[PDB]
Amino acid sequence: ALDKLKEFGNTLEDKARE
């Protein structure tokens, strides 16, 4: 559950995680 929020922070990270 809360998969919409948790997946969202994976986009942010992917932004400048490299």
DSSP summary character for residue 2: -
DSSP summary character for residue 18: -
DSSP characters over 1-18 = --HHHHHHHHHHHHHH--
Spatial distance between the Cα atoms of 3 and 18, rounded to a whole number of angstroms: 23
User: How far from chain centre, in Å, is Cα 15?
Assistant: 9
Spatial distance between the Cα atoms of 7 and 13, rounded to a whole number of angstroms: 10
Provide the token pair at 8.
């969202």
DSSP summary character for residue 7: H
Largest CA-CA distance found in the chain, in angstroms, rounded: 27
The coordinates were experimentally obtained by: NMR
Name the residue with tokens 């490299």: 18
The amino acid at 8? F
Secondary structure of residue 17 in the 3-state scheme: coil
